[PDB]
Amino acid sequence: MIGLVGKKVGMTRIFTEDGVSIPVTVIEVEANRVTQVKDLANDGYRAIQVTTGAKKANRVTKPEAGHFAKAGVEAGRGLWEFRLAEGEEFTVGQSISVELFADVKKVDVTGTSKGKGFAGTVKRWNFRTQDATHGNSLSHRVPGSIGQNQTPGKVFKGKKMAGQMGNERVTVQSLDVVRVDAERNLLLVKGAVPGATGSDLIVKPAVKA
Amino acid sequence: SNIIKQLEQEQMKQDVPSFRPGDTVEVKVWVVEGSKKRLQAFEGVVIAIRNRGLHSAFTVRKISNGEGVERVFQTHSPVVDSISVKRRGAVRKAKLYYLRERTGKAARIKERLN
Amino acid sequence: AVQQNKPTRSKRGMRRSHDALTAVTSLSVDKTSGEKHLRHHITADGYYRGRKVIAK
Amino acid sequence: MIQEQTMLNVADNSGARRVMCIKVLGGSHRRYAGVGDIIKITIKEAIPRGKVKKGDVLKAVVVRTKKGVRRPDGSVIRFDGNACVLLNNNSEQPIGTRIFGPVTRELRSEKFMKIISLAPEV
Amino acid sequence: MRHRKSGRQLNRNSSHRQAMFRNMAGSLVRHEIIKTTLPKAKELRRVVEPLITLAKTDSVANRRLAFARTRDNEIVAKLFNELGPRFASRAGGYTRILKCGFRAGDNAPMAYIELVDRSE
RNA sequence: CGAUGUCGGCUCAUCACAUCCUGGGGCUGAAGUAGGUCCCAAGGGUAUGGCUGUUCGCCAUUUAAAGUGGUACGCGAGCUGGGUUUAGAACGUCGUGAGACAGUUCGGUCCCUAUCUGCCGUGGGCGCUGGAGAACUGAGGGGGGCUGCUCCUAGUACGAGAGGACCGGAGUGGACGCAUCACUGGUGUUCGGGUUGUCAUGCCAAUGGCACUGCCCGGUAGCUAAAUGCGGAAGAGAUAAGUGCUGAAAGCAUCUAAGCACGAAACUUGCCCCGAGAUGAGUUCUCCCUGACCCUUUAAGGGUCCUGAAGGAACGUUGAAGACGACGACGUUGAUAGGCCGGGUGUGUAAGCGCAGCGAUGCGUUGAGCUAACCGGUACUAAUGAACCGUGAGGCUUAACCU
RNA sequence: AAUUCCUUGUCGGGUAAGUUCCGACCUGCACGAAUGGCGUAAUGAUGGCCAGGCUGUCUCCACCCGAGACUCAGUGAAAU
RNA sequence: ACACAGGUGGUCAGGUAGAGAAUACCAAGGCGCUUGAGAGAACUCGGGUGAAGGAACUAGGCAAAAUGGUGCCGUAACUUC
RNA sequence: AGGACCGAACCGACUAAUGUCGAAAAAUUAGCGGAUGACUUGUGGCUGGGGGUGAAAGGCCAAUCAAACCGGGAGAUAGCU
């Protein structure tokens, strides 16, 4: 169904009665409120647009201010858009709670990965290193040969090399939900979600089964 | 932060005796033999204590029938029942890792007695 | 390691197209004295935000 | 972690003092064995009147690791000095009568029932 | 990658920068104002400020820690008698950073760091 | 031949299909299991060692399998130099001899800062038809695609027995990939302590410097794996080999010529990501500008004065963002950073003083004293009021609705 | 065998497995007696092989401290 | 060829610890080596540490690690004793 | 007593890394071998190009060696580019 945007606040564990230690991750979902609803009559695809949190008045600009104004919504940080599914119609001003996950089993967390920075070939594509000694000169960690000889006479598009690793959108699929605390607005999901402590997180039900 | 602290507090049991590194502690834990909730005892010397609130754990070392068997315990797990103390020890070091080489006689420690 | 054919003026020129130095573009005036100084820096006479912090 | 070229201490009344794991068994290109795996070993040192001798090739089963195993609560059980129990090459059936030292809970996999019913601890 | 790893290296040995701020703190507490390089100034606040806080409670033990650092009986004498009283209520930052200009020989961003005083 | 550096290993690959496994079929000297062979199929996977310079191969033990080949028998401006083609030396052998030998034997310099093409990353400019901030559709492109074992089905079908399924379902593993520090751990020369030698602070006491952090013991945060979660699919469409149904040509027969239906990890989707420079430059929402004049070859013209907005850039504090640019937060209507307060964590009973002891030292005060990057708070200092860029209602033709 | 091509000769020991190593067989392609033969304690920055120890050599690398690499300012090459 | 990590003979030679003119730290005396300031990526160089395993690496244990001192006890085959 | 042993100065140059348009037309750092002798070194003489010297590699003779260097026969000749 529809997605739900939240914030990532550390991770701990939950001891069950049997003694199984389940590692959870605390995703605080403030209160996602619907900003705009798109239809076939104007855009060709049914989708909703949400926002969350709060932003300082002198930080949100007039373009954004006018937008939130026609929805009767308090300005929040960022905006997100979720694809609807054949029939689950909402409306502007509708306050989506965290209650929508009180029944589902598996969810999918999607968020900006912890940016490792400009990583080498070993750190990124898992290239096995060369001999640390036995005469090996000036090539303890380098990638080594990256192509064939004259016949190709180029380097194929897709060749793994040293580049920017991390700081991109990564989706971990099918994570078991553990507890859905209504009051405190916490969403305990099993395992480790992506992203640094305090980034955004698009949480939505398991697309596959 | 604040919210993560509350989820740690409501799980943390509040009845664990204070024990210092070097205390001959007897720890009783549960075990499942199919369908029998049996209580197994475990004697030993507490080597190191790692305090992290909810995630705290202490390490116990026992000289079994010929093999030095070490084991840790996630302090606040329902799998652990008692942290009954026997000998209040006293050694001038927080972590007792040197007891992994010491054997028999030279592997003992003094009592606190105060 | 080595070049093959000498690059023309075309490349030489265009290679310098991004090394164009950027001007200061702004010089805030002093609240009290009326001198000019960079943002968040002191003046020639040690005044700053209308205060003789250097006194030298 | 027990892998190729690893000295172990035989934990049973079978006749071998020290063994060496020649190849971890169970899957292709597998790095190492662990908790209750099966490893093909050779015997590097035996006792005079043993049931085996220096140079035999027979399967075994690791019961004690220096690395230790992990229970499903976050508890680790680290022994001291790796150890294994010798088996009968064709059928599991452990070759010894007594089994020195302790063993761990993961030996409850039907084809080792005999082993735990003989070990002193756990 | 230094994610959430505060503290600066400043192109010197471990030994060197420890001993280096020792000398700089001496200079600062004796002259109340120094014309130094900015990155150092940013880092100097993480040494001279704890010293003034550590001097807010006069004792014998505190003098030792104040001496264990800065190694000088005159700098410690400048503290505990001047700066102890003089602040006693500034529950926070004791020094001010003032970016000045650029050093003429190497184009290094210089800055003034001085105590929140000298209005006498 | 005014130089194209060759064997093997290492690293990294990439394609073909004559297919080694996995997938789908035919036939059988196919009962079942397990096989022989042929057809279709290149999505993915496709050992670790001992020996030799080895390729090859033998042997040991695995595995679902240890594929055959192209690519300068891939790859030295990436590595190694063992081998092989430099000088030394020796044995055998041939030569009277200098020396020779696809006869073997010890020893033996591997150079190059990257302009262009390519590639992995990340930006500056302009374009996109008035300017600006946001959020998406998706043309198109890439990643991912492997599988054992046990158990149920059932010791049923099959079979004289011994043995022993197809199909379908459940659970747990190996390899590989993605992601993350809560756990177990590694590091942690910025935290704490033990201690040898010496020097210095006038000396004792206490601390500091130096000796690879002096040597060591632990260790927060980060980072990370050996640690922990997760992923391959299911399903849908059109098909290959093949199985068909109906049915002529050809009274019959026949999968095909008309027509209809099944059919695989390949193909196209479904899963994840990049993505409107997709110059075919897309769509929606919101916001801002609705001042007068002269000159002229009167044209989407030039120029003056007055206004310069939305927003941007700039500067500053900086960030789990980072090579530099960028991107994210914040600029006192403030919690962005440093400090400070309190707590946490680490180390472990500070110093001083008292007592005991001849003395080292112990005991008490004392789980103290000190504490990095952490957590929750507080403006105490530093993020100044303004300046700078960008405008002044946005061309022409045509049509439909309003007038 | 520093010599043996055919050859990794055959046999025995070491090894889970040994084209090298060690002991022996004689079919010495083409050993052999001062262009010296066979032994040999001592010694070798000598060759080949095995064993204990210990280790990031490796399975498989992770962190960390420094000098460059990187940006700003100054001087300013070279092969081609 | 240079204000170059090179080469060049003789003499004096202090305090602590040490067997010492080794080495560690200092006195007398002389210097901080003629580019600096930041950032704290890959990768290279010189280094520190490391779970489990311990030559499985490879041409080969090359390199690293490790052993290391004084006093006493004790010490084989073989041999020109 | 010793072409004895362990080890600095001093002399030598085996391994590896760096450097290979370097700091240097063969060096640095970490280890290495000899170190009372056939040693090492200062100063000053002797030998000479088909000759010197050589614990013999065709090594060395001014970074040059299977015949040095400088000038002269000399514009050697060149079926070759």
Side-chain angles (χ1 to χ4, degrees), chain E residues 35 43 58 80 82-83 88 90-91 98 105 107 111 114 118:
Chain E
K35 191 196 305 179
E43 196 64 31
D58 192 6
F80 295 94
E82 291 297 326
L83 304 183
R90 189 84 67 188
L98 286 176
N107 196 356
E114 67 176 6
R118 309 166 62 251

Side-chain angles (χ1 to χ4, degrees), chain C residues 1-38:
Chain C
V2 181
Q3 67 178 356
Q4 199 48 47
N5 285 326
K6 63 180 296 182
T8 337
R9 303 187 185 75
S10 182
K11 304 294 287 185
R12 200 167 63 75
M14 301 191 285
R15 190 169 56 245
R16 289 168 192 177
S17 181
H18 291 283
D19 295 331
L21 195 57
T22 304
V24 187
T25 320
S26 305
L27 272 86
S28 67
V29 297
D30 184 78
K31 182 178 181 59
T32 299
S33 178
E35 291 182 359
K36 56 183 180 181
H37 64 282
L38 303 175

Side-chain angles (χ1 to χ4, degrees), chain E residues 8 37-46 97 99 113:
Chain E
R8 301 186 179 183
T37 309
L38 184 57
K40 288 183 186 62
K42 284 293 191 302
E43 196 64 31
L44 189 58
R45 293 181 303 172
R46 290 181 65 258
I97 294 297
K99 291 176 277 294
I113 167 171

Side-chain angles (χ1 to χ4, degrees), chain A:
Chain A
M1 52 182 73
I2 57 101
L4 181 131
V5 174
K7 177 180 174 62
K8 185 256 200 62
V9 185
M11 67 177 70
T12 50
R13 57 182 182 180
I14 302 299
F15 294 107
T16 59
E17 296 93 5
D18 188 74
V20 182
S21 173
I22 301 172
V24 300
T25 300
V26 187
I27 299 179
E28 183 178 16
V29 172
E30 196 66 31
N32 288 314
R33 68 283 293 279
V34 177
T35 295
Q36 186 179 10
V37 179
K38 298 180 172 60
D39 304 320
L40 268 82
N42 296 119
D43 300 316
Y45 65 102
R46 293 185 64 250
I48 62 175
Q49 183 174 6
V50 308
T51 176
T52 186
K55 187 179 291 295
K56 288 178 297 305
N58 53 3
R59 179 57 67 189
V60 53
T61 61
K62 289 180 183 295
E64 296 175 349
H67 192 64
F68 291 113
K70 72 171 297 181
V73 172
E74 291 178 350
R77 56 183 174 76
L79 287 175
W80 289 273
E81 195 166 347
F82 299 114
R83 296 297 303 281
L84 292 180
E86 201 61 24
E88 53 194 7
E89 189 65 32
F90 288 103
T91 184
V92 295
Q94 175 57 47
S95 181
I96 291 177
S97 298
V98 76
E99 292 301 322
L100 302 183
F101 289 98
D103 181 73
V104 297
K105 302 285 105 172
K106 299 184 177 181
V107 301
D108 298 328
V109 188
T110 296
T112 306
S113 74
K114 177 180 290 188
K116 301 307 178 58
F118 186 54
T121 67
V122 170
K123 193 79 175 62
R124 182 181 181 185
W125 295 100
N126 278 320
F127 277 0
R128 291 191 291 276
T129 58
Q130 291 179 1
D131 300 322
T133 181
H134 291 293
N136 202 348
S137 178
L138 297 174
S139 301
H140 300 167
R141 210 180 179 83
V142 86
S145 177
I146 59 175
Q148 297 76 14
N149 207 335
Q150 185 179 7
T151 308
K154 59 185 283 190
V155 177
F156 299 95
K157 285 185 65 67
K159 187 67 172 55
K160 308 173 184 63
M161 290 182 191
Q164 180 65 270
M165 179 176 74
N167 198 359
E168 65 181 2
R169 175 179 291 178
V170 170
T171 296
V172 172
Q173 304 178 357
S174 301
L175 292 180
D176 299 330
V177 68
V178 176
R179 290 172 57 192
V180 181
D181 195 359
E183 299 304 318
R184 303 176 179 178
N185 291 321
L186 302 181
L187 183 56
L188 301 176
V189 291
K190 187 178 182 181
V193 304
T197 312
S199 71
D200 286 324
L201 280 188
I202 292 176
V203 176
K204 61 185 180 183
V207 65
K208 66 174 61 179

